[PDB]
Amino acid sequence: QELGNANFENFIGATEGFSEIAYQFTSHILTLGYAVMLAGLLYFILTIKNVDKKFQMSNILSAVVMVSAFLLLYAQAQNWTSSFTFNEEVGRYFLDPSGDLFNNGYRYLNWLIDVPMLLFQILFVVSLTTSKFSSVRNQFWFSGAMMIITGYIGQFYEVSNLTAFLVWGAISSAFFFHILWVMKKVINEGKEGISPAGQKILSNIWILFLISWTLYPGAYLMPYLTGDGFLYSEDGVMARQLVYTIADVSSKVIYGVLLGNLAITLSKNKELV
């Protein structure tokens, strides 16, 4: 019944319920999510000394982000399985009040760790030319926080009030665009003065960044990307968490690995294998 300002996963769960496939996949993909993060934490810790001292902060901040991501995805995995429970007579999983409603907002507030750190860490690997370290940092952190907070507010209304949903997301999108702007600037300046091999890694980082970060606004909109459409369903629920997981792995783990490799490159006298 009355769900109020809740995520659409609950409305699907309280009305149609989820098939075995939809319920199991979502639980598996979230579990895959946190396993990758913990493993990633290990990777980043064990490779600290593969780069020169001054680049090591980047490994450290990658680890920091792994810790946050693992904790969150682990909790979000337990929340999924607590929120939906098998009805034997129907053969589907339905909303289970005593489990709490499912809410993606857990992710959002944790981005207050992830986003600032991911943006920050590249500043310990590349060299700026025109732009100033503290200034890029502050721009990254202000815009990151605003983006997140406004998106956080909006997602609570994804069902109860489409207008607020779309307005807060548009506002949040403005801050996102600024971030893309500043990061492209940072990538370019970071290319100045370094080896082709290093420039190549930076170019890959920019494509990865652009695509992986754009997946998140995609996950925000997922339920409506097909207009009472195909995605406003358990299919859209699965797709949302799939997109999140692909994005987390890409934006966090792969991103950090590439930065580490750029760092090996820029290090004397170390080279990639």
Ligand X SMILES: CCCCCCCC/C=C\CCCCCCCCOC(=O)[C@H](O)CO
Ligand Y SMILES: CCCCCCCCCCCCCCCCCCCC
Query: Residue 51, SS3?
Result: coil
Smallest separation, CB 209 to Na ion (Å) = 35
| Residue 131 binds ligand Y, judged by CB under 6 A | no
DSSP state of 49: G
- Closer by beta carbon to a copy of itself, 50 or else 178: 50
Q: CA 191 to CA 272: how far, in whole Å?
A: 18
Supply the minimum distance, in Å, between the C-beta of residue 81 and Na ion.
4
Q: In which element (H, E) is residue 52 found?
A: none
Binding mask 215-254 for ligand Y (x = CB under 6 A): ------------------------x--xx-xx--xx--xx
Query: Interface with Na ion includes 192 (CB under 5 A)?
Result: no
Candidate segments 34-42, 166-174, 180-188, 227-235, binder of a copy of itself by CB under 8 A = 34-42
Binding residue for Na ion (CB under 5 A) from 85, 131, 188, 267?
85
Residues in 12-31 at the binding interface with a copy of itself, rule: CB under 8 A: 19-21, 23-25, 27-29, 31
Q: Which residues pair with 85 in a beta bridge?
A: 94
Q: d(Cα 21, Cα 237) in Å, to the nearest integer?
A: 12
Among 180, 201, 193, CA closest to 272: 201
Q: Taking CB positions, which residue lies at the least distance from ligand X?
A: 164
Of 26 and 81, nearer to Na ion (C-beta) is 81
5 part of the interface to ligand Y, by CB under 6 A: no
Residue list 141-170, contact with ligand X (CB under 6 A): 153, 157, 160-161, 164
Q: Are 141 and 173 in contact (CB under 8 A)?
A: no
Cα 86 to its chain centre, rounded Å, is: 29
CA gap 172, 183 in Å, rounded: 17
Q: Which tokens is 73 given?
A: 């995805």
Nearest to 43 by CA among 257, 273, 271: 257
Query: Nearest CA to 146 among 111, 118, 182, 107?
Result: 111
Min dist. Cβ of residue 264 to ligand Y (A): 7
Conformation bin of residue 194: beta by default, left when phi > 0, alpha when psi is -120 to 50: beta
Closest CB 46 distance from ligand Y, rounded Å: 6
Bridge partner list, 93? 18, 86
Contacting positions for ligand X (CB under 6 A): 153, 157, 160-161, 164
Contacting positions for ligand Y (CB under 6 A): 36, 38-43, 45-46, 48-49, 57, 64, 67, 112-113, 116-117, 134, 141, 143, 145, 161, 163-164, 167, 171, 174-175, 178, 204, 208, 211-212, 239, 242-243, 245-246, 249-250, 253-254, 257, 261, 272-273
Contacting positions for Na ion (CB under 5 A): 81, 85, 100
